[PDB]
RNA sequence: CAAGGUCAUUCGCAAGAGUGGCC
RNA sequence: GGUCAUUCGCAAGAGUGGCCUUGC
């Protein structure tokens, strides 16, 4: 009855089983656990780490970087995250990891089915999707996932439950039916997550959810560990979160024309001058560069060429920074040269004089333009010093439905394949 | 009382804690388990895999690649391996891995000290060395190693034991002393390894070893798991192995002048012709090349230049191979051109026309010369295509006390550092 | 003094390419 | 055909190193 010990392998089973808008992400709450950079930063045990290998799962998605460490400290979570941010692994990994570590508990040890974990989904296509990922992370484990949803044969689902159910995925209406039929009890449900809670509300599932969570045998908030996921955060969702969550963490996650052009290092100042000379009366331009001395040298160059500009970087005093922000937003010096210091308001044009080394700085940078309904332009200079970001920038431009330079996908092929 | 679960970390403790002759290696026995290429191919659990990370052990030494899989399948082992082959990790990792997996057993649960594992060493230099390696692999575990040796204060060792001892490292004379004093009992010793058994015999420790292993409470062979390590294998060691081991696996692991020279690809045939033209009357030369058609094209070249040579590679029939070995061994065609097919007798000169991609194939190749008391010569041609083996070949030449080309250690610096 | 990113190398993992060897 | 091993490109993890960027 050790649940941290992996079962004997099975290769037949093995082969059967085996976006960018969400990168500005902030979690706020009491003693919020800091976000991780890799699945290695949390110790989720042999089975979980094993099955992570088998999925070929590489790095944690932005939501996974913040959700996973929150879940592992058994803190409730209200997460506003969209379809495609890696929500499923974000809660399935730490929950199962804890289930392996603790085992089934003396109630189910000295023993209808009692799932230790209940995942509620609005639709059949998402319930099955969550279920399929649960089997991949429960492979070679004694934890058996099940899935239960309306619109299909209830007789076959009943037959699957009786083969054992410790993690249950379900749609609200079909789960209510299984408890009236006395096939499921929630008396030992220590983990409850609600996926796409907004859609679950939109589809009219609140009475079933309140019946599942409040009018029956499920342990209350503070005892059970609760997670809510929803793409939008209207007040209806906030009131359900205050009803269902306890001392929780709030986690929150392209009207911009993006142009990438090839510019050799010795041509960058000339290319910049041409972009500035085509800039309107009082449009503000944000010029991002790599190094503090780069920002210093470039502001002097622009001054000697007759452009009213200013500068800001990490070694600037808070006073020097305020002076630059004054001249910039008064329009007197409408060009601001900055390092990463100014990646994290109403800027019309962001120029990546130097592209950054990682795709996340690129997101933060272009996020200073094209704000709240305005039109924004982001122009980036690219050469051989930037192949380290070829593949991630190409993937981003494709997702953003931006024009992709034909030579850029050619260099992604030639370097990565 | 779960021993697979890691303890809370400890920062202070962490930084407190954190050859090439041995690579022709063969294990023979009944259903001998196959050798591994990485520590990952055997599942030694969270704690072990953890602490391997923390020591930064990257790959298994040749002895480890064969010993570890043998130990994990609970097979006795007689290993002829020298100090410096990674013996300690070879038995410490799988033994501790199993102890974590099984725990202490229901005997020690309901409870002088009873070590589950006893390591016997000839000297305190090796006892302390093994003990320090055991602490690195038992960090954050509930398994406590101890070390006990003559020549030091027995009073301090006694008080270390009663803080708990599950893995005991000891010298024979000081151990028997502890069991006469009733401080150590062997009634639960399921793992026994004897390190440098030859030296232990040389130093006169057989009566103590026979008293420890045969005349007291240690479980007999076939019940306990026994491993013997010794640098030499005289018949005295073999008789001790037949008394102490049960259905065991036998594991067995610089009179060659080695020259490395820079040869561009278009110059190799010219360089080879000069080596052949300086070859004695009835000396046999082995010329190793990379590809089968490389071997074909080179035997044709040597033929059209008037050299009696022959060839062998993987796509040659057993008949074609015997014909080539006939002309080679008779002296009629004293040059044999071969791929790796002939790396694994009385060869005077081995020429690595093409250096191999891995350092293991290199030694197997040079092992065909300088055998049975004969000064052998090994000539290797090197260029840009062989930088992948720069550091392994440089390290090997240094250990072999061979002359190192000054340009070779310079290219190791510029590529790896 | 803390964080993070990139680059070199070492190392385990997958996909891919090339080559070698075994039946 | 089927198995195995090595190397190289890339993806991702850990350490060393170098470089750079931030916070105080
Ligand atoms: Cl439903
Ligand atoms: Cl339950
Ligand atoms: Cl200031
Ligand atoms: Cl050793
Ligand atoms: Cl002694
Ligand atoms: Cl014992
Ligand atoms: Cl034949």
Residue numbers in the entry:
A (entry chain B), B (entry chain A): 134 to 151, 162 to 254, 264 to 405, 413 to 503, 508 to 580
Please give sentences taken from the publication describing this entry.
Found in all kingdoms of life, DEAD-box helicase (DDX) is the largest family of RNA helicases that regulate RNA biogenesis by unwinding short RNA duplexes. The D1D2 core of DDX3X is flanked by N- or C-terminal tails, which are largely unstructured but contain motifs responsible for the unique functions of the subfamily.
Our structure shows that the assembly is composed of two D1D2 cores and one RNA duplex (D1D2:dsRNA:D1D2). Our structure of the D1D2:dsRNA:D1D2 complex resembles a clamp that cradles the dsRNA in the middle of four RecA-like domains (two D1s and two D2s). We found no base-specific recognition of RNA by the protein, indicating that the D1D2 core recognizes phosphate backbone and 2ʹ-OH groups only. As highlighted in the zoom-in boxes, NTE residue S181 and D1 residues S183, T201 and R202 recognize nucleotides 11 and 12 in the central region of RNA Strand 1 via hydrogen bonds to both 2ʹ-OH and phosphate backbone of each nucleotide, whereas D2 residues K451, T498, G473, and R480 recognize nucleotides 20, 21, and 22 near the 3ʹ end of the same strand (Strand 1) via hydrogen bonds to phosphate backbone only. We also show that MolA mainly interacts with Strand 1 and MolB mainly interacts with Strand 2. A total of 26 hydrogen bonds formed between the two D1D2 cores and dsRNA to stabilize the pre-unwound complex. Our structure shows that two D1D2 cores jointly reach both terminal ends of a 2-turn, A-form dsRNA, explaining why DDXs, which function in a non-progressive manner, rarely unwind RNA duplexes that are longer than two helical turns.
